[PDB]
Design a protein around this ligand. Sequence first.
Ligand SMILES: CCCCC/C=C\C=C1\C(=O)C=C[C@@H]1C/C=C\CCCC(=O)O
Ligand SMILES: CCCCC/C=C\C=C1\C(=O)C=C[C@@H]1C/C=C\CCCC(=O)O
Lengths: 274, 263
Amino acid sequence: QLNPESADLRALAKHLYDSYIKSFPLTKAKARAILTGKTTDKSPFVIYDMNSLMMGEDKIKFKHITPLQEQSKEVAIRIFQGSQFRSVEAVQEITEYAKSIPGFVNLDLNDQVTLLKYGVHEIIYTMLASLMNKDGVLISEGQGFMTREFLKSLRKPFGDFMEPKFEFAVKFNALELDDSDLAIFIAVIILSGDRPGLLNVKPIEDIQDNLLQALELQLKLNHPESSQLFAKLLQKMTDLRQIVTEHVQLLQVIKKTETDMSLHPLLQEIYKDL
Amino acid sequence: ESADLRALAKHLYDSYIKSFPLTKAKARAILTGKTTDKSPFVIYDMNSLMMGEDKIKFKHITPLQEQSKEVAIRIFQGSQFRSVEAVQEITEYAKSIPGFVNLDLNDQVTLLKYGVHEIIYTMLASLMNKDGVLISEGQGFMTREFLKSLRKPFGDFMEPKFEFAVKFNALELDDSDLAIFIAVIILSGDRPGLLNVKPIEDIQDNLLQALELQLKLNHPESSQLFAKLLQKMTDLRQIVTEHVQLLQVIKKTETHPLLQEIY
Ligand SMILES: CCCCC/C=C\C=C1\C(=O)C=C[C@@H]1C/C=C\CCCC(=O)O
Ligand SMILES: CCCCC/C=C\C=C1\C(=O)C=C[C@@H]1C/C=C\CCCC(=O)O
């Protein structure tokens, strides 16, 4: 119970959390409810092999996550392209959230683009953890669940495109953060003044500082018993970079190995000279 | 508790001073000028590199027999020799961090094996400015441009560190700050191969509380310094993996047995 300074920090966290619920259709709260398999109304269909994938398509309504095409004749590529269009959608969701971050749209246009360019994938993997457990990941807005082993057995290049994420997710999830915490953390990620090419770093840092103050307060009030949670969370920022890097790397291999597979233009630009 | 946190801080600082000959305070005085009028020997080109070798006998722009006669390579090797020397200083310091020596011996080794590079680069910033780096316990000054002038993959082997340095030094941390930060880096529980992570995380938790307090007491003005400092650990690790990739190319191409074992 304290000052007007802390009051503004609480108002900020509320605004961000509010925007978060409004920008992301599938929150961590909903993901855990589905994953903890509590209910009889939210049960996901599980894909763990070829025949379940074959049934899942029939049961699950995979809203063109892999736009028009029969069977690209390779589950591996269908699955991959799918992960791509979903990524694109995720970028759309994140971009919308970014606009709600106080001060973000007031920044220089080119810098707005730079921050999104380097921040969206770090955010994507951060939020993906919410949809994961050590055994698999939720898909189709929680309608389905694809096992970690099914993926890990796809085929040479693809067979391991999600593993690093799972390794991250299991660790990150140990922090037991909730949507109210993630909303501010993701805002911090985007307002990173050390992104390559930023024209005006100061205004960005001023904004990030306020967000960090907001995040720090949020974590002590929400997780009283979690000593140094603030620092452990910030330290996870290093794991995200690594995830992104080896992903981009695997992508260069795919590009050369699959001369016959199209990669989404938005994603290509995001990875250009990244 | 804010009592034991200051005791820990002070203890770390006192050990830092005893383990590292050239502190940041001392280095800054030189780099800026406020040193006894005993300027450092400046290496800005090949001819100055030589006079330095003979005038100040740089510990090790090491005239070994079976390897010299090639500037860029002797410069690269020298950084390796000084790195190995730094590892012993860091190791000594680590043993002074409360709880460290009481950890599983293999974990102690693992923590050092994976933490020294990050510490080496964190501390190298103390001796660098946008124009150059201090060498030979601050007895000399080697230009950023001269280093960048080396060719092959060498010309750019120090540039990444300089970039890091400039951004890191912007935080204006001093030795008492760095002492705790360095300790925090060592007690990283995410190093691969660790057998008992709990003790490490517990100590680091204590170290983080101390650093947090230290920064708030020492830099009241700088908002979220603690947070910004932790975010630099991402920068360090990036430099390390990057350095690793160069050591890897210098092996692809680029053509004494005991020295090689030590270093
Ligand atoms: C829809 C088929 C099931 C596969 C689900 C697996 C991963 C889903 C993800 C997201 O929704 C967001 C990120 C992951 C995908 C991992 C990397 C995509 C980065 C973009 C690219 O492929 O270049
Ligand atoms: C603490 C050690 C790690 C920082 C790297 C140290 C030296 C790097 C150098 C170059 O990149 C080119 C020349 C130097 C190597 C020559 C002498 C270093 C001695 C420094 C000292 O004793 O303080």
